[PDB]
Design an enzyme around this catalytic site. Structure first.
Site, PDB file in Angstrom:
ATOM      1  N   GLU A  67       0.796  -1.219   0.000  1.00 34.66           N
ATOM      2  CA  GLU A  67       0.000   0.000   0.000  1.00 34.66           C
ATOM      3  C   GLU A  67       0.832   1.276   0.000  1.00 34.66           C
ATOM      4  OE1 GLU A  67      -3.347   0.372  -0.241  1.00 34.66           O
ATOM      5  OE2 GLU A  67      -3.318  -1.794  -0.583  1.00 34.66           O
ATOM      6  N   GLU A  89      -1.865   9.425   0.303  1.00 33.01           N
ATOM      7  CA  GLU A  89      -2.278   9.140  -1.064  1.00 33.01           C
ATOM      8  C   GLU A  89      -1.641  10.155  -2.006  1.00 33.01           C
ATOM      9  OE1 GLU A  89      -6.439   8.353  -1.379  1.00 33.01           O
ATOM     10  OE2 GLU A  89      -6.535   9.072  -3.455  1.00 33.01           O
TER      11      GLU A  89
HETATM   12  C1  LIG Z   1      11.679   3.410 -15.534  1.00 27.16           C
HETATM   13  C2  LIG Z   1      12.223   3.870 -14.192  1.00 27.16           C
HETATM   14  O1  LIG Z   1      13.332   3.485 -13.812  1.00 27.16           O
HETATM   15  N1  LIG Z   1      11.454   4.677 -13.464  1.00 27.16           N
HETATM   16  C3  LIG Z   1      11.702   4.791 -12.041  1.00 27.16           C
HETATM   17  C4  LIG Z   1      10.402   4.986 -11.271  1.00 27.16           C
HETATM   18  O2  LIG Z   1       9.556   3.865 -11.486  1.00 27.16           O
HETATM   19  C5  LIG Z   1      10.714   5.143  -9.769  1.00 27.16           C
HETATM   20  O3  LIG Z   1       9.523   5.545  -9.067  1.00 27.16           O
HETATM   21  C6  LIG Z   1       8.711   4.549  -8.550  1.00 27.16           C
HETATM   22  O4  LIG Z   1       7.714   4.258  -9.540  1.00 27.16           O
HETATM   23  C7  LIG Z   1       6.756   3.268  -9.101  1.00 27.16           C
HETATM   24  C8  LIG Z   1       5.853   2.973 -10.283  1.00 27.16           C
HETATM   25  O5  LIG Z   1       6.617   2.598 -11.419  1.00 27.16           O
HETATM   26  C9  LIG Z   1       5.984   3.790  -7.889  1.00 27.16           C
HETATM   27  O6  LIG Z   1       5.040   2.787  -7.453  1.00 27.16           O
HETATM   28  C10 LIG Z   1       3.770   3.218  -7.099  1.00 27.16           C
HETATM   29  O7  LIG Z   1       3.816   3.682  -5.747  1.00 27.16           O
HETATM   30  C11 LIG Z   1       2.545   4.198  -5.299  1.00 27.16           C
HETATM   31  C12 LIG Z   1       2.756   4.791  -3.919  1.00 27.16           C
HETATM   32  O8  LIG Z   1       2.905   3.774  -2.939  1.00 27.16           O
HETATM   33  C13 LIG Z   1       1.487   3.089  -5.310  1.00 27.16           C
HETATM   34  O9  LIG Z   1       0.215   3.647  -4.927  1.00 27.16           O
HETATM   35  C14 LIG Z   1      -0.555   2.913  -4.033  1.00 27.16           C
HETATM   36  O10 LIG Z   1      -1.433   2.073  -4.801  1.00 27.16           O
HETATM   37  C15 LIG Z   1      -2.345   1.309  -3.977  1.00 27.16           C
HETATM   38  C16 LIG Z   1      -3.106   0.384  -4.897  1.00 27.16           C
HETATM   39  O11 LIG Z   1      -3.543   1.077  -6.056  1.00 27.16           O
HETATM   40  C17 LIG Z   1      -3.280   2.260  -3.236  1.00 27.16           C
HETATM   41  O12 LIG Z   1      -4.214   1.518  -2.458  1.00 27.16           O
HETATM   42  C18 LIG Z   1      -2.449   3.163  -2.334  1.00 27.16           C
HETATM   43  O13 LIG Z   1      -3.290   4.134  -1.723  1.00 27.16           O
HETATM   44  C19 LIG Z   1      -1.352   3.880  -3.141  1.00 27.16           C
HETATM   45  N2  LIG Z   1      -0.439   4.513  -2.214  1.00 27.16           N
HETATM   46  C20 LIG Z   1      -0.241   5.823  -2.255  1.00 27.16           C
HETATM   47  C21 LIG Z   1       0.618   6.408  -1.147  1.00 27.16           C
HETATM   48  O14 LIG Z   1      -0.715   6.552  -3.131  1.00 27.16           O
HETATM   49  C22 LIG Z   1       1.393   2.471  -6.714  1.00 27.16           C
HETATM   50  O15 LIG Z   1       0.524   1.341  -6.681  1.00 27.16           O
HETATM   51  C23 LIG Z   1       2.790   2.041  -7.203  1.00 27.16           C
HETATM   52  N3  LIG Z   1       2.732   1.574  -8.575  1.00 27.16           N
HETATM   53  C24 LIG Z   1       3.207   0.371  -8.896  1.00 27.16           C
HETATM   54  C25 LIG Z   1       3.110  -0.048 -10.356  1.00 27.16           C
HETATM   55  O16 LIG Z   1       3.709  -0.398  -8.069  1.00 27.16           O
HETATM   56  C26 LIG Z   1       6.973   4.114  -6.762  1.00 27.16           C
HETATM   57  O17 LIG Z   1       6.281   4.726  -5.686  1.00 27.16           O
HETATM   58  C27 LIG Z   1       8.058   5.076  -7.264  1.00 27.16           C
HETATM   59  N4  LIG Z   1       9.074   5.237  -6.241  1.00 27.16           N
HETATM   60  C28 LIG Z   1       9.356   6.433  -5.735  1.00 27.16           C
HETATM   61  C29 LIG Z   1      10.420   6.483  -4.649  1.00 27.16           C
HETATM   62  O18 LIG Z   1       8.804   7.467  -6.094  1.00 27.16           O
HETATM   63  C30 LIG Z   1      11.800   6.216  -9.531  1.00 27.16           C
HETATM   64  C31 LIG Z   1      12.303   6.216  -8.097  1.00 27.16           C
HETATM   65  O19 LIG Z   1      13.172   7.315  -7.859  1.00 27.16           O
HETATM   66  O20 LIG Z   1      12.950   5.986 -10.369  1.00 27.16           O
HETATM   67  C32 LIG Z   1      12.623   5.970 -11.760  1.00 27.16           C
HETATM   68  O21 LIG Z   1      13.798   5.818 -12.474  1.00 27.16           O
END
Ligand SMILES: CC(=O)N[C@@H]1[C@@H](O)[C@H](O[C@@H]2O[C@H](CO)[C@@H](O[C@@H]3O[C@H](CO)[C@@H](O[C@@H]4O[C@H](CO)[C@@H](O)[C@H](O)[C@H]4NC(C)=O)[C@H](O)[C@H]3NC(C)=O)[C@H](O)[C@H]2NC(C)=O)[C@@H](CO)O[C@H]1O
Ligand SMILES: [Zn+2]
Ligand SMILES: [Zn+2]
Ligand SMILES: [Zn+2]
Ligand SMILES: [Zn+2]
EC number: 3.2.1.14
Length: 242
Positions: A67, A89
């Site tokens: 999450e 969120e």
């Molecule tokens: C190509 C490349 O190298 N790109 C890199 C980036 O990918 C990377 O950043 C990270 O990116 C991922 C997605 O690719 C991201 O993941 C998402 O994170 C959010 C936050 O936790 C999740 O949202 C949750 O979803 C659930 C279910 O839908 C909800 O119930 C919940 O409320 C949400 N939580 C929040 C707080 O909103 C997403 O589900 C999730 N997506 C996936 C596909 O898993 C990471 O958070 C990114 N990481 C960071 C640190 O930002 C980046 C990192 O620096 O580097 C790029 O190079």
């Protein structure tokens, strides 16, 4: 007392990169807050065999890590080392306020996802707050500013049943008795049914799913650190949603 199942060292090894600069919640989630929150839910990590207790902790941290994950494919130490990176969120979000005389929304407040389980909506902030003795309807932001309150809301979710959905805790500690409907739906005890409990309508029963696989990745990594087997039925790919 949950400290008898997971040490501060293990906690930081699990939630390894949560305090990296790229993480929104850096500095927020602490082991002490986790332990303090756990004290309010005595049964957590203290019910069942030692193995069941370890899984109770690993599963809780795994589902909450999903999450709040900051992981990605090429992330240092893998995607499963980036749980607990966020506490609110992402984006503009929404009010998440629905008519309720039982848990009325407070003027100007929004109930978007906050904390480890991304608690959402007034009708969830309401009972969660009552459970921990805090008015979360009037001060929902506390879930994102007080780490102990934050962890407590997540444990409330973990320990609370939503009949016919059992509590996630009951499932993982082997205290859940599936009904005939559950057996017909293929919902057998294990980590998989917990995923179903949390978000089955969208993730379960339709074959391989990357969101389910992410949850499992965290769970296996955490079980490995505590040194416990995963148990059976880890996925919900063939489980009909609740
Ligand atoms: C190509 C490349 O190298 N790109 C890199 C980036 O990918 C990377 O950043 C990270 O990116 C991922 C997605 O690719 C991201 O993941 C998402 O994170 C959010 C936050 O936790 C999740 O949202 C949750 O979803 C659930 C279910 O839908 C909800 O119930 C919940 O409320 C949400 N939580 C929040 C707080 O909103 C997403 O589900 C999730 N997506 C996936 C596909 O898993 C990471 O958070 C990114 N990481 C960071 C640190 O930002 C980046 C990192 O620096 O580097 C790029 O190079
Ligand atoms: Zn530490
Ligand atoms: Zn780091
Ligand atoms: Zn809604
Ligand atoms: Zn589907």
């Amino acid at each position: 007392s949950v400290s008898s199942i997971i040490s501060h060292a293990q906690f930081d090894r699990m939630l390894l990169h949560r305090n990296d600069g790229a993480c929104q919640a850096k500095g927020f989630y602490t082991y002490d807050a986790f332990v303090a929150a756990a004290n309010a839910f005595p049964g957590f990590g203290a019910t069942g065999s030692t193995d069941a207790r370890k899984r109770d902790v690993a599963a809780f941290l795994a589902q909450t890590s999903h999450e709040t994950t900051g992981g990605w494919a090429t992330a240092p130490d893998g995607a499963f080392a980036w749980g607990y990176c966020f506490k609110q969120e992402r984006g503009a979000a929404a009010d998440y306020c629905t008519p309720s005389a039982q848990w009325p929304c407070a003027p100007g407040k929004r109930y978007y996802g906050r904390g480890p389980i991304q608690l959402s909506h007034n009708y969830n902030y309401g009972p969660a707050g009552r459970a921990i003795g805090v008015d979360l309807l009037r001060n929902p932001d506390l879930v994102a500013t007080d780490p102990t309150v934050s962890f407590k809301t997540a444990l409330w979710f973990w320990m609370t049943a939503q009949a016919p959905k059992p509590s996630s805790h009951a499932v993982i500690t082997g205290k859940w008795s599936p009904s005939g409907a559950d057996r017909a739906a293929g919902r057998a005890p294990g980590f998989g049914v917990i995923t179903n409990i949390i978000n089955g309508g969208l993730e379960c029963g339709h074959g391989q799913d990357s969101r389910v696989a992410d949850r499992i990745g965290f769970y296996k990594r955490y079980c490995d650190i505590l040194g416990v087997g995963y148990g059976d039925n880890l996925d919900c790919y063939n489980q009909r949603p609740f």
